[PDB]
Amino acid sequence: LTSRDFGSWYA
Amino acid sequence: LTSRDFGSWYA
Amino acid sequence: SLALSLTADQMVSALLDAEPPILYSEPFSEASMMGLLTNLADRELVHMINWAKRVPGFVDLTLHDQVHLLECAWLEILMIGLVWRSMEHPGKLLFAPNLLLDRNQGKCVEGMVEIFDMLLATSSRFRMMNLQGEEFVCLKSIILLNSGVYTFLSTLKSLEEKDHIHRVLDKITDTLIHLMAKAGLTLQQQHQRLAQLLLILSHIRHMSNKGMEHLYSM
Amino acid sequence: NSLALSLTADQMVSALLDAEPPILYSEYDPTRPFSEASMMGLLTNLADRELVHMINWAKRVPGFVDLTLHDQVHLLECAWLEILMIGLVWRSMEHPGKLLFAPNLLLDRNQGKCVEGMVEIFDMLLATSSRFRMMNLQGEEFVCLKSIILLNSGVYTTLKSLEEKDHIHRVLDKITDTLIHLMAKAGLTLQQQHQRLAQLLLILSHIRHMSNKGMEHLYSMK
Numbered sequence: 001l002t003s004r005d006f007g008s009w010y011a
Numbered sequence: 012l013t014s015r016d017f018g019s020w021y022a
Numbered sequence: 023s024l025a026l027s028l029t030a031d032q033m034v035s036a037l038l039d040a041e042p043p044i045l046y047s048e049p050f051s052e053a054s055m056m057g058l059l060t061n062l063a064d065r066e067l068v069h070m071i072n073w074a075k076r077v078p079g080f081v082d083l084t085l086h087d088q089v090h091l092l093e094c095a096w097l098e099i100l101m102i103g104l105v106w107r108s109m110e111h112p113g114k115l116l117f118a119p120n121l122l123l124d125r126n127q128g129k130c131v132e133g134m135v136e137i138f139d140m141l142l143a144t145s146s147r148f149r150m151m152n153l154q155g156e157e158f159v160c161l162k163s164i165i166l167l168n169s170g171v172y173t174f175l176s177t178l179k180s181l182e183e184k185d186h187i188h189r190v191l192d193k194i195t196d197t198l199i200h201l202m203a204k205a206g207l208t209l210q211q212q213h214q215r216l217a218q219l220l221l222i223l224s225h226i227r228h229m230s231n232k233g234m235e236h237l238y239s240m
Numbered sequence: 241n242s243l244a245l246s247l248t249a250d251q252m253v254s255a256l257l258d259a260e261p262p263i264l265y266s267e268y269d270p271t272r273p274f275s276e277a278s279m280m281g282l283l284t285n286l287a288d289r290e291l292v293h294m295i296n297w298a299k300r301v302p303g304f305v306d307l308t309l310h311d312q313v314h315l316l317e318c319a320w321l322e323i324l325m326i327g328l329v330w331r332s333m334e335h336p337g338k339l340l341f342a343p344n345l346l347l348d349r350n351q352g353k354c355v356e357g358m359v360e361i362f363d364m365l366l367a368t369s370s371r372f373r374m375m376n377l378q379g380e381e382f383v384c385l386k387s388i389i390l391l392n393s394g395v396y397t398t399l400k401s402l403e404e405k406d407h408i409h410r411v412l413d414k415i416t417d418t419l420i421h422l423m424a425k426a427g428l429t430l431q432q433q434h435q436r437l438a439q440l441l442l443i444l445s446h447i448r449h450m451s452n453k454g455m456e457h458l459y460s461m462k
């Protein structure tokens with residue numbers, strides 16, 4: 001689990 | 012005397 | 023709103039027009055020095071209230087919101103003013119034309135040398151960027167509108183007030199970019215410099231917070 | 241071209257994403273019901289574990305380890321609470337009105353009242369969550385802001401001195417290029433790009449404010 005598993009990402 | 016009397020200004 | 027229909031040149035003119043008087047101060051001890059600084063600040067606060075009412079957008083807010091913004095920003099505004107007028111004096115703080123102090127003298131007030139060093143560092147950063155007065159005046163208006171916006175407070179009106187402030191902040195951004203473009207900066211240089219300027223506001227916040235802590239302690 | 245200033249915008253984003261720290265779970269022992277830390281102990285324990293990961297993250301940020309050790313420690317000691325806080329806000333954005341300290345420790349505003357003085361700080365973090373939601377802050381933007389906080393917060397607090405401050409400012413400029421590129425690639429106009437960059441940077445002054453208030457509180461409860 002990191003920040004990359006939360007919220008919206010441009011890509 | 013104001014800030015205008017100090018430093019550099021673009022104009 | 024007057025504010026949102028202003029061109030970049032007209033915003034600059036309005037902010038220049040609004041600039042307050044630079045005051046003259048009326049051995050040292052901690053007591054006397056804080057006395058001088060307190061007296062000068064209290065006089066500058068009178069002029070600051072009238073300045074703030076001349077910042078495009080500010081008068082469109084309720085009197086309650088105007089007071090709140092000034093209560094949050096006032097020390098930041100005094101400090102950025104100080105840094106600006108100290109820019110051409112490496113190693114010194116020009117509190118007034120007749121009160122020019124170096125850091126040795128900051129140590130008069132236990133706790134103040136920390137703050138004095140931070141101010142000098144900001145002054146040195148301004149100098150290192152060759153900050154111009156039009157940019158300084160924009161930054162000062164940003165502090166006014168921005169510093170207390172996240173601690174407003176429950177009504178539709180209030181949400182409408184925040185939207186307004188953000189709209190004006192966007193116009194000040196456009197104005198900075200305009201000044202920089204007119205000064206012959208590349209698009210790349212324009213965004214880099216916009217970032218450099220706005221990042222200094224975090225440091226001005228930090229200094230105001232340390233200042234407020236010191237004032238409360240005493 | 242593997243050094244920091246040589247990286248393209250895409251390569252910088254990619255490197256920063258690779259360096260993201262783990263999101264920790266709050267430690268729990270079902271066999272120790274009665275020594276469950278107070279609210280403050282739970283947050284302290286979490287934060288201390290996060291700080292170990294933070295040092296290693298910072299030292300993976302391209303450019304950071306080019307600084308002297310003294311300067312690295314300085315920047316870290318200035319930024320650490322801002323960095324915990326922005327990380328907290330990111331992961332809390334999908335939980336309006338709440339703070340996701342950990343996947344197994346999701347707290348509401350009123351739980352902030354468990355520590356005198358803490359609710360003020362919870363309120364400010366919640367307003368940040370709300371600001372980020374209203375902007376539709378994207379992950380790659382959050383990741384650039386963290387690095388900006390690391391490099392910026394202690395820079396303002398002698399030849400090589402100036403040399404090091406010069407290097408920091410160059411890396412900061414590269415991260416600005418990186419933010420702009422992300423926005424440009426997303427199809428924002430130049431005007432929308434400059435307006436958005438400024439909106440994001442102004443939130444950093446609020447994050448500074450929150451960290452100042454938190455440090456004050458921590459130092460009071462010594």
Ligand SMILES: CC/C(=C(\c1ccc(O)cc1)c1ccc(OCCN(C)C)cc1)c1ccccc1
Pocket residue numbers: 059060062063064066067100101103104117134137138233234236237
């Ligand atoms: C950094 C200089 C300074 C003040 C100052 C800054 C800029 C300026 O143009 C004039 C003064 C300062 C000192 C005292 C002060 O008291 C205000 C109390 N009034 C509002 C009742 C305000 C600013 C100060 C602030 C806090 C602690 C120690 C010193």
Ligand SMILES: CC/C(=C(\c1ccc(O)cc1)c1ccc(OCCN(C)C)cc1)c1ccccc1
Pocket residue numbers: 283284286287288290324325328341358361362453454455457458
């Ligand atoms: C606001 C949440 C918080 C902390 C926190 C923030 C984000 C996060 O992911 C985890 C915790 C907090 C609490 C305690 C703390 O102390 C660490 C002590 N070490 C450094 C010795 C740090 C942050 C806190 C900070 C200051 C005062 C009271 C509470």
